[PDB]
């Protein structure tokens, strides 16, 4: 029985995000990729760096934006700039949201020594794909 990245069947009441409801064998069939970069294509270099980098930005966004994160965080790399999209729940009063926008962009840009672009799409409640 494969336990990989899966969400078990409950008494049937458990709310589930579209992503967490689609099991590993489904990648590239229904589900998409959470990140995008050149590094894994045939002739390409430095895949590892974009992986460490990605991981750290998962943890970073989960920690800078407490309790307000909706679904897993969507990274794109385009021509040396990062485009970080987030689905974010509405909890915070908007001031704090922009505080953290500036905070994040600046901090990251100076950490990875490349320009970062941030996008928050705000959602009233976690989207429910199944059950509920």
């Amino acid at each position: 029985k494969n336990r990989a990245a899966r969400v078990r069947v409950s008494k049937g009441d458990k709310p589930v995000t579209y992503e967490e409801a689609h099991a590993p064998h489904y990648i590239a069939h229904r589900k998409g990729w959470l990140s995008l970069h050149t590094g894994n294509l045939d002739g390409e270099d430095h895949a590892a760096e974009r992986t460490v980098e990605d991981v750290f930005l998962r943890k970073f966004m989960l920690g800078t934006f407490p309790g307000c994160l909706a679904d897993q965080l969507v990274l794109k790399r385009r021509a040396n700039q990062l485009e970080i999209c987030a689905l974010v729940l509405r909890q915070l009063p908007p001031h704090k949201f922009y505080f953290l926008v500036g905070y994040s962009e600046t901090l990251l840009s100076h950490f990875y020594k490349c320009p970062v672009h941030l996008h928050l799409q705000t959602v009233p409640s976690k989207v429910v794909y199944k059950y509920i």
């Binding site: 590239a28 069939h29 229904r30 998409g32």
Partner: protein, 311 residues
């Protein structure tokens, strides 16, 4: 849920305009065919399952049909069969049986099939049981069993469908070369890592050339030359035709077989329309579906397994 359909169809049209104006087409002749190209170019998802790819479509194809309101605002139900829990089914049944009865008082292989179970389920907007379906179709046989009136025939036509069947080996028109003014036919066989192309000239010396060398030299294995001989010995043309050949990939038997297929394909221009069905039943023109099977991990040979131990 009907308010949703009104709203959705409105926004669908507004978004339709919005699509045309950006995509730069006349909003009038814009089709679904164009809708597809449009989204496909705007939101290019490589994804294997095609339902999970982006869609903008008329809500009717998007959403399932609904069962309408089944009772007035007094609580009182419209249809008299409502309490059967399937009105949709038993209405068809009442009507069908009525048709039958009237037929009995009055009376004193085109590729046509009955609906599937799923199609009657779509027609009545009603879940069905196998038994139920079977019952009904049985009844339609009873209907066909008697003298068929006009409205009787229309009635059973509702539940009629029609299916295509196509069998012919597709016949290439020949090709007359400009150089000698002579006719040739160029076949392509493919077997098992090996493709071959064979040009067959209609007036031969019996000459058969392979990759620029003679066929005896290129197939020192007798078996192969026999395989080659098959189509020509079949059609009794053995000396009559002159073939040029180019084959690549795989090992010798695979090659000889590819040439078999390609040749037998290029030989159906110069043969009679009747001998074609023979070459089919000889199995000459049908590819070999047989290929190597991938090893599986934790096994040996795709089938062969590591020796299993009871203790």
């Amino acid at each position: 849920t009907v308010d949703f359909i009104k709203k959705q169809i409105e926004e669908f049209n507004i978004g339709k305009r919005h699509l045309a104006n950006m995509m730069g087409e006349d909003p009038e002749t814009f089709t679904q065919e164009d809708i597809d190209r449009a989204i496909a170019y705007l939101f290019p998802s490589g994804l294997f399952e095609k339902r999970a790819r982006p869609i903008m479509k008329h809500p009717e194809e998007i959403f399932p049909k609904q069962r309408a309101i089944q009772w007035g605002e007094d609580g009182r139900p419209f249809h008299f069969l409502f309490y059967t829990g399937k009105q949709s089914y038993y209405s068809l049944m009442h009507d069908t049986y009525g048709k039958l009865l009237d037929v009995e008082k009055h009376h004193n292989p085109i590729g046509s099939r009955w609906l599937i179970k799923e199609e009657l389920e779509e027609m009545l907007v009603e879940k069905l049981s196998d038994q139920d379906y079977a019952q009904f179709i049985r009844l339609l046989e009873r209907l066909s069993a008697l003298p068929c009136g006009a409205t009787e025939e229309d009635f059973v036509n509702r539940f009629r469908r029609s299916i295509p069947x196509x069998x012919x080996x597709x016949x290439x028109x020949x090709x007359x070369x400009x150089x000698x003014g002579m006719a040739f036919s160029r076949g392509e066989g493919k077997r098992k890592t090996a493709k071959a192309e064979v040009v067959v000239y209609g007036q031969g010396s019996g000459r058969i050339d392979v990759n620029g060398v003679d066929y005896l030299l290129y197939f020192p294995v007798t078996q192969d030359r026999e395989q080659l001989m098959f189509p020509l010995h079949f059609l009794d043309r053995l000396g009559k035709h002159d073939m040029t050949c180019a084959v690549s990939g795989g090992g010798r038997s695979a090659q000889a077989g590819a040439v078999r297929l390609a040749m037998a394909r290029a030989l159906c221009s110069f043969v009679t329309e009747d001998e074609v069905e023979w070459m089919r039943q000889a199995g000459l023109l049908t590819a070999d579906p047989r290929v190597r099977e991938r090893k599986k991990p934790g096994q040996e040979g795709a089938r062969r397994k590591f020796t299993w131990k009871k203790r």
